[model samples]
Target chain A: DVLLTQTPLSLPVSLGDQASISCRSSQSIVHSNGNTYLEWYLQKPGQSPELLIYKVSNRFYGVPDRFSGSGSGTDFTLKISRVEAEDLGVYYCFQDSHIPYTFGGGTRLEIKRADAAPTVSIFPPSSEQLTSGGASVVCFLNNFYPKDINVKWKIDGSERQNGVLNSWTDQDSKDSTYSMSSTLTLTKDEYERHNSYTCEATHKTSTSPIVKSFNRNE
Target chain B: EVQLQQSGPELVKPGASVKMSCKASGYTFTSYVIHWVKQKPGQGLEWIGYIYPYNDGTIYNEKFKGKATLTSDTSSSTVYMELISLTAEDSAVYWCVRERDNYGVYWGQGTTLTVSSAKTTPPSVYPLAPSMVTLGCLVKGYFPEPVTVTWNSGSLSSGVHTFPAVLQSDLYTLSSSVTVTSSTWPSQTITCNVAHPASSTKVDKKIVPE
Candidate 1:
């Protein structure tokens, strides 16, 4: 299999700023046909990928003059002279010269923005809290930036792994922040034995985990 | 709008020769060179050579010097590649492309050449759901390995991955998978069209999930 490696997994940029991405192949992309088949693509958020450059350095149809491609053999470069708002997304380099066509790992072009920590809350069970039966507790997270966050459920400060379910993070269309929720279910006997039910969230904005707790028998 | 319209697929017997055509449109045919490349089933490309359509001058890869001949009809803006001494190993998809300064800007849809029509079997297509929304098509028990597998008759493009053909015994097999959108699964009739040229048969396996 031909491997195409992309550099700078995460690219930070501003509007109108130029951006560059590198795509290197494990072998030369030049076909015995004497032409390099390398092409560049851009996948915007929530959109399918679209071609930007084709055949090494040729700009695809309707592509702006700002975007250009260069390089041959094993190395290729894709440059955006003036990045626009619509250009905030991921870029990939592809080769069809070789069979089992290969694509480079994506490079995300993200705008430099402030990180927003999520608002965390724990909700008590709505169902009966029988000692023999089980009770469910939920931790809710809202309005977080960068979407990628780690959550942990703790019982009296110890991490609990059983009967825990996490939901996928959802992004808001307007603000571009994210929200998610997790649930913990355990027998009422185990719940009553614990003094505190804690939900800790780790985000890029904080050096320590964001901790929220609820008293079991307040 | 520059287009390379190539001839249809061909099925020929061993020791025979087949000539394929590529007609160019929306560009000056004589302004650039027309190149031909060979792609064995599930393998990489091998450049056969190029023809300066303006003067019909040819430059061929040394490996393909005796096996392929390149010619052009400038008046009709078409280029041809005639492959001689056909064998099972000569079976492949040949592409006609336009190049400038070492860059291929336009390409034809490709002509698939099958050198063996004897003892060919039509493949059986099986659909498998490896994930909640991913659909896989397994084409097995086909000879001469030039099967064309397309999703929904080629309406879709993204999220589809076609693996390289694997040789098992005397037959070739391959798996192609497509990630369907959550909204498209169960409600839509997804079809996997597998065309086995060697046997002159096509299979349209539809997956209608309940």
Candidate 2:
């Protein structure tokens, strides 16, 4: 059996921007016979996924020239040039190189609105007693447009940058946008003191930053 | 104008079995192969197995060998999959996909099956013996297919040697072996590894010098 791992979770693409999606296979898809059975597909809403590229680099029947697939062995790449409005859907990569044919999680190509940033969500510590240990507060930005949004953390109206931030450049969709997460861990003292925190997201197109405010016990 | 109508949701107890159906219409039913695809909340799509109705030819992913049974009724023009020994994690939306030009184009409405329990038993491993002077060990009757057998020295792959797992009386029997010499065989132990998502299931059977 083969396993395919797709990244970017989601990617937002502006029309005409070249988009690239990567699919990594857990094992070499090259069979003993010297053929790589990797294929790429495009699935629009309410439609079955169409074969776009097959046998590693060859385009499938009637596929647009803009969609190209490349790479070999464990790493494969799919690129779509000049994104079209009709091309907004999840794209999947598959490998028929072995039994239990596998597919990547899929990458969605979407239209990114210049005026939107991801909606901010704050999930603070939700448990009482804190397990007498530590707690964590997580801020997520999902359903945002474009790939240039910035997320910041502030405590008690002062800016703080010490938390762990994972900005996924691996957004697989081009229009649906993606969620970037930032986590702030609280020490035993901070858990008891219950300090207020704010997660702010700044976008290039927005007039003001969208913020999600969280304070312990609030 | 192809249509695939599938059965509805299913809920079963752990260790129990469940069967689902996919009815095909508007085309030559025997002209195409029907494959099962499984999807979960975050686990991506999985192609389980497929049946070519015209010849009753069946193929299973090594992982689904004993877990899934692909069947068809040419008279009724329907394809079926019987999934056994349900577990909570087996719960997922399954679609019967129709293959066209080697790839699936039309898929049936999903049949959601939810197993009501999280119970599981640790896998069992039988005694191991190598392929005489050169290669291929024999270890039979184990739950869960696709167990990675290694020699802890190098690769366990070179040719087509993996055997399909068999299911008898509810227990899965797995044995994937390759040919090897003592140079490639384990001097101390033979390693069997199955990388299940929850945790790694590792088994090493020691072979005393004979």
Candidate 3:
């Protein structure tokens, strides 16, 4: 008995929206020493569960401010506001109060709210060879809806700023949807390394953002 | 290459008991502790407890205090867990892992268990003051689950001012507030409601007709 129980086998969500997962333990997980064993985790597809909420409402350092955990004794809850595209995944309630502690099955917060998900692709700099320098990644997002759109850049999990983000509404149907684009510039070494560079697009149409990683293809 | 392999599925009565196992390989079994995990569909990963293979020593989650027992078999380099008086609420998957670097590493595949029942309760709302205009509510006693809060002030509602909900340590209860200018609150009914994402039924508290 991890002593924790969670519900709603799955959560279908939207972007900029708030959502939470409940973690109920069989008893108080507080230690005889006064510390709580309760924590919250997020496990993306094909990834290990990362601790997000700890000790009743405290967030792990450097994690997005959107995630929070609260509750003590046998009941605990993990709340998240402005669900980011990256927040999609299974969440588990964890306990360390006792030896051999276990993690719960986890709740899946699905980005299933999209009427149509944004589709995107990346175009690397003209020079096929990256080691030569002057590398820039151009990304395009097509057929995304609900107007308000955002394009972001990330290198190995951390965010990058000072880049160009542009969008234009398609006049064809008149609903005012868009085709968005963004540019991220990297140095010769930054582009030559095997590290990851990704572009993510968000739209109100779906909470799940469209993500594309550059392959260094011109 | 620390390898951990666990036993499988169990179908039992609501008040019955079950014992499962985790076999280890690749490293000195006595050199590390074995931790167990539990999951129910999307319930989340929760640690049941851990055990020292070098000795019979054990500790437990206060919540799982009487529910689980941990023991290690040094002779076979294996770990065992016995869960007692189970319920439908306990139906789910369980895992074994090695704790390293403040996280679980080298995890076992898993074991599944099913006990006979299922259900959950929902939370309720019940708060104040000054022309500075304080509108609040206390939402209490429900399932230790998702209970969202939304604030409303008739005709005076603004996207501009709001705050996050305050949750009681018990996890089953909650509260929230919104600050409106005295000018925006006069004679207007202000409401705070808690709703479930999957349900239309909600519980609310309102300070009205001031």
lDDT of 1 at B118: 64
What are the runs in model 1 whose C-alpha is more than 4 Å off? A1-218, B11-13, B28-32, B40-46, B74-76, B87-89, B99-104, B114-118, B127-136, B155-161, B178-188, B208-210
TM-score of chain A of 1: 0.65
TM-score of chain A of 3: 0.53
The interface root-mean-square deviation of each model, in the order shown, is 15.0, 21.1, 20.8
Of candidate 3 chain A, the 10-residue stretch with the lowest lDDT total is A169-178
Q: For model 1, how does the per-residue alpha-carbon lDDT over A11-114 read when each residue is reduced to its tens digit? A: 87755788889999998778889889898888654343567888899897678999999996688999989876567767888787875556677787765445
What is the per-residue lDDT of model 2 for residues B154-184, given as tens digits with 9 covering 90 to 100?
Answer: 4444421333344443433333333345664
| Candidate 2 chain B: 10-residue stretch with minimal lDDT | B128-137
Task: Please name the candidate that would achieve the greatest lDDT relative to the true structure.
Answer: 1
Q: How many clashing pairs in candidate 1?
A: 0
Error of 1 at B125 (Å): 2.3
Candidate that beats the other on DockQ, 1 or 3, i.e. the better one: 3
Question: Deviation in angstroms for B89 in model 2?
Answer: 1.0
lDDT of 2: 0.66
> If you assessed candidate 1 against the hidden native complex, which CAPRI class would it receive?
incorrect
> Could you arrange the candidates by lDDT from highest to lowest?
1, 2, 3
User: What is candidate 2's TM-score for chain B alone?
Assistant: 0.54
